[PDB]
Structures are given as C-alpha cells and as structure tokens.
Amino acid sequence: IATSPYYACNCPNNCKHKKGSGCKYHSGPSDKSKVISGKCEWQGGQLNCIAT
Numbered sequence: 631i632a633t634s635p636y637y638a639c640n641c642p643n644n645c646k647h648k649k650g651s652g653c654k655y656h657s658g659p660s661d662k663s664k665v666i667s668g669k670c671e672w673q674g675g676q677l678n679c680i681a682t
Contacts, residue, residue: 631654631655631656631663631664631665632653632654632655632656632665632679633655633656634655635653635655635668635678635679635680635681636676636677636678636679638653638654638655638670638679639651639653639670639671639677639678639679640676640677640678641677647670647677647679648670648677649670649671649672649677650669650670651669651670652667652668652669652670653667653668653669653670653679654666654667654668654679655668655679655681657681666681667681667682668680668681668682669682
C-alpha cells in the first residue's frame with residue numbers, strides 16, 4: 631500500500647501526483663492497516679492525500 635498521504639502526493643517525494651490526482655494510503659499499525667482511497671489536495675503548499 632502507498633505510504634503516508636503527505637509523501638504519496640508530495641512533489642519532492644512524488645511529483646507524479648498533482649492536485650486532482652487520485653491516491654491511496656494506509657492508516658494503521660503493521661500490516662493490519664488498510665489502504666484508504668482519496669484525492670491529492672494542496673494544504674497551502676504541501677500535497678496531501680485526502681481520503682473521501
């Protein structure tokens with residue numbers, strides 16, 4: 631599963647994804663975590679994946 635929402639959408643770490651681009655990320659301990667769908671959105675300068 632994709633890493634944190636911040637890094638997945640972040641440009642310096644992932645410029646592939648831009649605002650409006652779909653994205654996913656796991657939010658839980660160990661493998662027990664589950665991939666959460668979402669969309670990349672700017673938080674005033676940084677790209678973060680916002681799970682809908």
